[PDB]
Structure formats: C-alpha cells, structure tokens
Symmetry: D4
C-alpha cells in the first residue's frame, strides 16, 4: 500500500513516549511523519527526543522530516469565517502541506463583512480544491459553494455560543447548503478534509 | 382598542363555520385578516362572506378594503427561493393589510448571489427588511451584514432531510443576531410582518 | 459606512493586549468604543493601559469614552424575570446606553409574582422598544408581549436547572409566544438585542 | 376493587368490536369511561351499546349514569385557547365521571390576560386547578403563581413549527413546578383529571 | 397572602451574606424559614451568624426555627429507587417536614430487587401522598403508581450514566407511565414535589 | 450454508412481485420467513404462492412447514399490553419458525403487576425471555430483576405524545442492562427472536 | 456560463406546469436534468415535452441527449441494499448526465460482506467512489478504509425505528472521515454526483 | 437465590470504607467478589485493608478471591475497534473471567484496517458469545454480526470527538445493524454485557 502518503499518528490517545517509539520505527525515511491533535505540553515532553521536529502550536500538529517539494502544481485554498476557526484551519493547512500540496490561506472572510471574501475571490476561484472552515454561523460554505465551480469541502468547528450546540448547527447548515458542490466532514476534522482534498488535488 | 391594529383570525385550527361567526360578529373594525386559511376552507366560506378576498399563495383572507400606507417608507420582503414564496406572501399580505408599503425582492438566494446585489439598493432603501429562507437559511446572514436597518428573519419549513422542518434554517439565523438580525418562529410570516409594521410606523 | 454606531469589540476571543491595540487605533475620536464579553481578570490586565476606561462588572463590558447625550428622546425598557438574568440584562442595557439610547431598567418582575410586573407596567408601556430577558421559565415574554403594543425583543438566558437545557427551553418558549409582536435573538445575546433595539428606537 | 374508581378503557388502539367485548363483559361496575374514541368508531359502536353517550369534543364515551358529586368543592379546568378545548373536555368529562363538580374556565390565555383576571375568583375557589395550554404553555406559570391550591398542568400538541408536538409547552410548564405546579404528559387530559379527582376527594 | 406556608429562600443564587439579611428580616416569628440548594461551604460562611440554625447536609437545606407540630395527621411517603437518590429525596423530606407534614422515608426499594419495595408496601399505601424519586431507570414510579390509589408525584433525578442524559430519560419515563395517577415535576426538583405534596396532604 | 438458519425476507420495502421472485428462486431451503408483510401485499401474493401461511397480527408469512423444536427448553415472550401484541407475535412466529418452543405470556404490564406474578413460574422456567413493552418500557426492568436467564427487551412504537415513537421505552430498557437485560431496536421483534433462538439452541 | 455544467431543475416543490415553463425557456443549454420528479408529475408533463426521458427508479427526467464521457476514468456507485437503489440511481443518472462513465456496484452491504470483496477490483479502479447506505451506514467505513480514492458517502432515509429518517447513517458516516470519506445530506444522490463529477473530470 | 454468580459491588457511589464493610461481610467464602467502577485513588484508600485484593487499573475493577476454574469449556470473545475501547473492554473481560468464563481478547481490529479483523476471525468465530466494543464509528458490530452466527452483544463507548455525542452515535449505529443477531446494552456498560454473555456461555 504505497499510496505515497506520509505516515500519520493520531496523538490524542498516544502518550509522549508512545509517539517517540512509533516515530523512530518509521524513521526509515519512509516519508515525512505527521502527528495530529498533539497538546502543547505533550510536545514539551517529546522535544528532547526529536530535536529535528517542528511543532505547529495553533494546529497542534507535529511534523518530523521535510517533504521534498509539492507533488502537484495546483493548490488548495483554506477559507475561514473568523479567527476562532484558526486552530482547525491550521490543522487542515499543515496536513495538506505535509501531504505535498501547496496551500493558500484565506482567513477571516466571514459573511458579516463580505467584501473581505470578495477581495480574495480570485485566490479562492483559482484553487483546485477549497476547504471552508466555519463555526458560529457557518453560512460561508453556502456562499463559497455558490461562487466557485470547484470541489468544496466544509469543516464545521465547535467554537460555540448558546445554540451553536458545539458545532452541530454549523454541521447541519453545511449539509443543507442550497449551493451544490459542497461536501462535509465531522466537527473539527480539519485533518480529514485535507486528506480528502489532497487526494482530489493530486489526480 | 383603536390603536390602529386590524383584527386577526388564525384559521389553521378554526372551522369554516366558526370563521364566519367570528367575522360576522366583528363586522360591527375596519379590515379583518385571517391566516393559514386553506383553499378548500375559502370555497366553503365565499357564499357567506361576499366582500372577501382570498390570497391563494399566502393562504390569507381579507374582509374590508386594504388601507393606504400610513407611512412614506416601505418594508422589503426578501426571499431566498421560489419555495419560500408562500410564507413570503403571508408576510407581505399582512404588512400591506397593516398599512405598509411592501417591496418584494424574491428569489435571490446565495446559490446565485449576484441576483441579491442587483436588488441591493432596493433593500437598503427599506426601513425594515424581512428575510425569508429555508434549507440553510444563509440569506439572513448575508443581508444582515449588508444593511443598517432592522432585519427580521423568518425560517421556513421547506427543504429535505436534515432541514428538520426548518430547524437548521432557524438555528442558522439565530447564530447571526449580533449583526442586527432578529428571528421569529418557523413559517411565521405573520409574526414578522406584525413586528415589521410596528417598527415601520414609528 | 458612517452609521453613527460606536465601534464594538468582541473581547471573548481577543487578548488583553490585542484589545489595547484596537482601542488606541480607534482612539481617533471616531466615537465611543464598547467591548463585550470581557472577563474581570482580562480587564485587570488592561486597566493600567486605559486608565480612562469604565468596566461594567455584571455586564462584563468595557466602554472607553463617553457618548455625548442620548441621540433620541424615546427610551428602551430592559425587563428581566429574575436576578439570574442580571448579567445579560446589563450587557443589553450597557450596549443600548453606549449606542445613545436612554434605558429604563425593570428588573425582577417574573410571573411567579406578577404584581411586580403590573407595578412597573406604565414604565414598560411607555418605552419605544422593550427587551425581555428571561431564563428558567421565560414565559415573561409572552405576558409582556400580550400587554404592550410596541416591539418586543426577547433574549433567552442560559441560567438553567435540569430540563432548562442551557437556555434552549427559554428560546423555544419565546419563539412560540401566543402573543404576537415578539422577536427573538440567540441565547445570552444581550448585545444583539440592544443593537436591534437601538436601530428601532432611533428612527 | 370497590375503591370508588370507575373502569377506564383506552380506545385509541382498541378496535370497535374489542371495545364492545370489554364493555359487554364489564356490564356485570357502575360507570365505564372510554377515552380517545374516534367519531367513526362510535358510529360503529352505537347500535350495539344503546345506553352509551358520546362526547364529541372530548372524544370520550360513557356507559352508565354519571354520579353526583361526592364532594362539595369543585375542580376548575382552565384553558389557554379554543384549540386546547378537546383535551380540556377530555379532562372535564373524566372529572365529572369520577364524581367531581367541574368548573370550565376557557379561552383565557396570556395573549389577552385580562380575561384570566375576570375569572380569577372562580379559579381561586377551586380545590384543584387543571391548566391546559399549548404553544408556549405560559398559562400554567401565571396560574401557579396566583393560586395556593394544587395545579396540574397539561401540555397540548396543538401548535405549529417549533411547538414540537407539544414539547415546548411541556418543558415550559416543567420549568415552573416550584410554584405549586405538577405536570402530566402531552394531551393527557385523562391523567390530569385522574389525579385531580384523587386530590379533590380527600 | 397568609397561606400558612413557611418562608422559602432559594440559596442557589443568593450569597451567604445576602441570605442572612433576609433571615433576620423574616425573624419576626412569621413562621420557620427554609433555605434550599445551600452549599456546605456557604453554610459554613453563615453559621457564626445564625447559631440556632440547622443544616441538612445531604438535602443541602437549612431551617431556622422549629415548626410547632405537624399541621395534619396524615403523612407523606418519600420513596427512592437507589442511594444516589438520597440528596433530592432528603430535600423533599426536609421541605415537607418544614411545611408541617409527617414524612415516612422509604429508601432503596428500586425494582432491581422488588421484594424490598413489597416489604414496605403497607407504609407506602398508608400515605396520603407519595413522592417517588428515581434516576438511572426511574421505572419505580410506574410500579408504585400501579400499586397505590393515592396521588403520586414523581421526581426525576440527574444521577446519570451514559444514555441517562442527566435525568432526561427518567423524566420521559415518568411522563409516559402506563399506571395512571402519577404527576411529574422537573429534574431534581424535590422541593417542588414536597410543596405540591404538602398542599395535597393538608386539605 | 446448512447452519440451520432459515432464509429471511424483509418485505417492508420489497414489492409483492419481487417477493414472489425471491421466494420462487429460493424454493430450490426448507422454511422461508417474510417479515413486515402488509395484509394487502399478501392478498396480491396468495394466488402465486399457494403453500404459504399468513400470520395476520404478526404481519409475517411462512412458506414451508414449521419444524419441530430442536431443543427441549422453551422461549417465553412476555408483553406489557394488548397493543404490544403485533410485534410480540412477530417475535413468536420467528422463534417458532427457527425451531423453538414459544410460551406466550401476554398483557402483564406493571399497571397491574399481580398478573405478572401469576405467570412468574412460566417465565422463570424459560431458557430465554423476550420482553415486549411500549410507553414507559418499565416491564423489562421488573422481569430482568426477577429471573436469572438472558432477557432480550424489545421497545415498541405504540404510545402517545412523549413516547417519541418508542424512544422512551428504548432508553428506559437501556438503563437496566446491568440486571441481565439486553436490548434490540424499536419494534424489532424479529431481531430479538433471532438472538433468542441462537441462545436457546446451545 | 459555458463551464460544462448542464442546467438542473429541482422538481420536488415545482409544479408540473412550472417545470415546462423552465424547460421551454431553457431550450434556447445542451442537456437539462430534473430531480425528485414524481411519476405522476411526468405523466402530466410528457405530452408537452416529447423529447424527454424519465428514469423511474431515479425519479429523474432528462431532456436532450446524454453526452459521451469526457474523461477515460469512471465513477463507481456502491450501494448497501436494494432499498438504497432509488437514490443510487439518482446519483448514477446525474453522473452520466454530467458526462462521466458510471459503474454500478449494487447490494453489497456488510450483512454479507463477501459480496463487496467480489467487486473490490471494480471499486478500486474508480477515480471516485460514491457509497450509498441506510440503516447503520456502516458500508461507507468499510469502503473508505479499502480504497485510496476520494469517497463521497450518501446516507439514505430508508430504515425503521431509530434510523431517524437517515440520521443514524449520516452520523455513522460522519464518524469516519479521517479515512478519506466525505459526506452529503440525507438522500442527496444529486449532490454527491455533482461533487464526484467535478473530482472525476480533473 | 444461589445462581452461582459472584457478588458484585458497584463502587461508583460507595466510599472506600463502605466497600470494605461489604467485602468483609461477604468474606464468608460465598464466592469471589467483583467491584466495578472503582477509581484508582479509591483503591489506594482500600488496599491496606484488603492486601489479598487485585486491582485492574484499565478496567477500574477490583476482585478479592480467585474463582477456582472456568465453569464451562466455551469462551467469550471481547472484540474492540480501537485502543480507546480498552477500559470498558477490560471491564467486560474482567467481569466475564470473574464469573467463571474463559475470555479471548481480540483488540484493535476496527474497520479502518479490516485485515486485522480477518486475521483474528477464526478466534472470533470459535467463541460461544462475542462482545463487540466500539466508539467513534462503532460500525464494527455490524461487520462482526454479519460474519458470525453466534450471539453478539454490542457495547457502545463514550470515547467521542465532535458528533460522537458521548457514545450516542455508536449506540444508534449498533441498534440499527443491518446484520441480525446483535443485541445491545447501554453506553460504557461493559459489566452488563459480560453479565449477559456469561449467562449465555454457561447453559
Ligand atoms: Mg447591520
Ligand atoms: Mg402557589
Ligand atoms: Mg438477573
Ligand atoms: Mg483511504
Ligand atoms: Zn440559501
Ligand atoms: Zn399562551
Ligand atoms: Zn409499562
Ligand atoms: Zn449496512
């Protein structure tokens, strides 16, 4: 199963020592190695062991090794509604770049001020895949889906106030988009979106 | 009493004979509005109330002559899709019956959003904006951020699957009230127009 | 976009330093500046920098600058069912006064003792807009809506016991009011209600 | 046995023939009450049980003569709207069948609350109060705070949109039990009257 | 409004000082005074001020004054399914005794072992009102309701595991009791049940 | 293959012609069971499959002769009310078709619980107990605590209001599995009997 | 405009006359697809649009000739059961109308999983895989882990009891997106094929 | 009621002293004694008193005494989807072994990599009862149910991310299994599954 994909470790349930055991075993230059959902403290416990490792604080991700160069010319656009979407957005962007994709970040363009979205519309329309990340309202996916004729993958986030229902509302909003060409992943699953986006980008 | 408001009958649960009794008793008020009045129920009603007008799409019935606008400004009724039109007309007929000029801005949902910008001057020129949308109710958020007038958003129960009979649109519109948006219950085109009329006539 | 509205900062996601940067940039006497959802500790970190700032503890709001005088004669009435509604009520009242409205506070008139509501009925009926704030039961909006012929904006609060469902029950109760002329915002969104109320009051 | 309580048949799921079998077998008890009995099912039943009375609005059927009140005091059945009347009559017919005087206080919902104060003396004079309401069920809270007698609140499934088939009214009434209010299931006019009768006849 | 009921203070939202102010104001021998939902720490802050006060730890209630004697001969039976129901059961029992009722405690008779319920059936059937308190399953109300021909008031508790949904399941179970003569209050509202039970007991 | 289990057809979504095609193709297995088969669909089916038996209450259809019990012990099917009988018969017909002796213990819900104790020896003598209940599903908890044999509980969708189409009974039965109870989906009388048969024939 | 995509009409809420108006106006585009078109509505439509083809199972209607595949690769439409076939055909007809070769892999749900392995080479050879499943939607998880191509999963509303009109399948499929799976709304066979076509034609 | 079952103590609500009182009372060699849902700290408070007791950290269970030998030849298979299922899996396995069953552990065979499940299929098919334990997706029960013709008892776990809804999704997935012969218990109830499995295994 040499799909060319880097090795991925889900560090939510793994200990800081348990992770080190996997990384040194996969340090046979198989590929670069991505570790997701890695707490900042858990990286502190790991850094003396892997001094050549890079931690992405906001994304809570850790990469060891450097992917050589983008595998494909096309890029993925990661679009977010607000600043509260920065963590899972960064998780999606770090995953896509680790998987060999160029990534264009289009942050803070929610529909409360829509000129910000129109200012960066040429960048979004030029992508081969667009990942839309939004919470509170999450209506941005429907607006983006109606403005681009490229695959859109929508990520609901759990940044909630009141009836946000820990991201449930954003999830339902994305599933019921009037605009077609939108497809959805589970709440906060920025990694998964980038995994699917990367497959689409590299055909 | 004598505070301008016409009498309103909710005909969803009331029988066609009961409606005649309420209307015949109240013909001693100027206009009378009846909401959620099925097309069959109006057929059973028309021989008895000959001065009545039925609004097919709105499922509303008026007896008496509709007044002329008491206020210069108008109310804009903005709708996302063609499905959303029944409840839109229910709001628009109520607003006109309460003495407000109504501007209809229909079928401008965000699946094609250039249509909304084409009619943006009309919406910004309103004193109150009623936004009517189903499925993902995202039209309310876009309008709320583009105008600086009170917006009342109406979620509709038109949609399929996880629309949850309008719940998704209702929750979507509720998650954007900091932008000047306020919300009414699902399909409640009457209630929105009732509030819009109070705001419009200040 | 000179709507005359003061500048508003949502301090839930902003840091105490990040806020200071925005306030000093908007200290070009554009208008007074309101900051919402500002924790008491976060204000402590900010006060040495803005010594001319006023913190409203219960409202968790911060205003810098003083709006000159009410822009309109009419007033907004802020009506609450119980003492547990005081925080979001104060957030609504501080927002409306910062936006240039006179505000009349009618607190603790829930329907468990309804004479208290009738005692202050002349004050509520005299308003141009009424904001009703209630949790636990939230039936007060339907009672107020049936007693006034002016716009009512209902705010559900998340002060819950058991089946209160963190304010969901109060939200559903307000949406299904038998009394007409009621309009609703999301849970705890006292700011938003005052924003809509202010637009109605100043026509 | 011989504890005063009449026999009760739930006719919602039972067939019109099965009901005759249960009634004909039990005509060896004094009165017999049957609840949720459709109008069509009574037509199929009337030639067989000639001594039976159907209560159209209540969808109830009694065989045998209704007793006279065993207790001086009465039960008050308070309702918010005209829609709420079917389940109100279901409770009132049950309460009368169980030997209680019933006082009907109908159509006093809080959309016009002066109507409730007009009938306040009648409600306070009851020994038990049954409150019946739909939509926002807010009538139960107002009554619970105004009387110092047990209140049993019945949520009804009449309403539209987010009424959730009576859930909103049920939750609203449940959030006010500290005031002397107790709650039964949606549309359960029988159950409320069954409890009210036990309380009334102490 | 001299209903003869003692004064009741809901101490969930009141401070330990705020409570002392109310108690000394109502210390005009109006009646005994009950305080509900009073944390153990909050009572520690209050006890130096009211040395003649009694705290009921499990019930989290505080009574000052002693009601003279039961107002009525009849008693209320407080029935619980398990030991986890002891707090709200005690809140109901302390409220009923403070309101002038004799109370018979029938604890730990859940239907997992039903002989325990049958052992105390004569006590339960002899009551004038029965309060049934149950969580996890809450099926005990339907069993009790089918065994007694006296008013049953059912209290759902929020002692939950998994699908218990913080007492929602027990609440729905009680509302749908096949046995008639059952009436329901909100989750954990042992006070409210005793308030309604006391009115029924004293007719 | 040849593991004793008869072939099973789910006829809820399958057409009356499609069923004949599946049955006619499989008549090359010993018995064939078809579940959720409407009464009208069997009328359209009977001229084509003349060796078939319809079980009206169970809405099941068997082709082929029902085997004799392969095991001495029996399965007990315990039901709370008369409404619960259709899904009870669906389970009982499946269990008999799979070669198990079935003992029916019907209408013993806890509204009158002496009835259950009258039949307690029969239930304790079973090797597996299937409990079928709606509304509050409390019968499963009482049985689970009284017998020391596997209990499989079936929630039914019969009930009104907050029954939530059987959700309340399902959750009630799920909150008592520590007592030896296990649960299947709402109305799934087949699934319970399928598991009971595997347990009974050990 | 001129971006390859055919015009799409949602005929669920639109009337049979309104559809003719939209189609007759747009016959000035190459193909036109109409979704959720009832069989009765097509009968009322056929005398007016004689060049139209109805796809009974898919409830779709095409006017104009279906193009030939613009791309070598094909899309695989994988389904769990025979019930799932209508929405599967809705996706497959859309995909073929958008110019993609479609490979149908039907009735391979995990109740018998050898069937899926029999057709595993066909699925792995696709460029995009659409998985269609109801009840427990577990087929999407198995496929997502076996192929290294984009998988779009469609939950269907076919099922009984706690299926919750497809919610259980939707949530099940959403809990496995880390494996290369992406999800659309319940019954939304069109939406999946719309996205699959964009991915397939890169 | 000499069913031969060991005595079981639910230590979630019992104190460390309260447990010691029950164990010494049941130390009349009635059988071995199992204690479930026992926190690691609560065992520390208990160990000086029962020095012959065995704590199962992952299972959070405590057994005192040693069951003599398996009561039946047949074994129960405990199958899990991921490592996050290890706690309730161990609770089920420790309960079944304490009740006198041989237990075969088949861990980490979720359908994200299904060859792992096929590698151990002979072990699973050889069982007399299979307990399937899964969260996140919980689709493994339907796959196992369709592969074995023996009783399957499915346990949903509350190891959740986003829309996992604290195990609700896994519970609904298991109840709606297309594969027949599956039966379900409440969330995290590994004990209950083993209790039912043990009865089936020992016929
Ligand atoms: Mg605005
Ligand atoms: Mg009272
Ligand atoms: Mg047992
Ligand atoms: Mg993959
Ligand atoms: Zn839209
Ligand atoms: Zn009302
Ligand atoms: Zn029952
Ligand atoms: Zn399946």
């Amino acid at each position: 199963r040499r799909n060319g994909f880097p090795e991925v470790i889900y560090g939510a349930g793994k200990t800081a020592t348990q992770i080190v055991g996997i990384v040194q075993a996969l340090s046979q230059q198989t590929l670069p190695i991505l570790t997701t959902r890695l707490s900042a403290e858990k990286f502190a416990a790991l850094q003396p062991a892997l001094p050549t490792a890079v931690y992405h604080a906001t994304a809570q991700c850790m990469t060891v090794g450097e992917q050589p160069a983008p595998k494909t010319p096309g890029y993925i656009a990661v679009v977010t509604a607000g600043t509260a979407d920065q963590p899972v957005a960064e998780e999606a962007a770090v995953t896509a770049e680790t998987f060999g994709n160029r990534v264009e970040r289009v942050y803070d363009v929610g529909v409360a001020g829509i000129h910000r979205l129109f200012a960066k519309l040429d960048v979004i329309r030029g992508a081969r895949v667009v990942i839309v990340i939004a919470g509170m309202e999450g209506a941005l996916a429907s607006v983006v889906g109606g403005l681009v004729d490229k695959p859109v993958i929508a990520v609901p986030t759990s940044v909630g106030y009141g009836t946000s229902f820990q991201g449930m509302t954003a999830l339902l909003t994305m599933l019921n988009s009037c605009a077609s060409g939108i497809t959805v992943v589970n709440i906060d699953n920025g990694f998964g979106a980038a995994y699917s986006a990367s497959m689409v980008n590299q055909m």
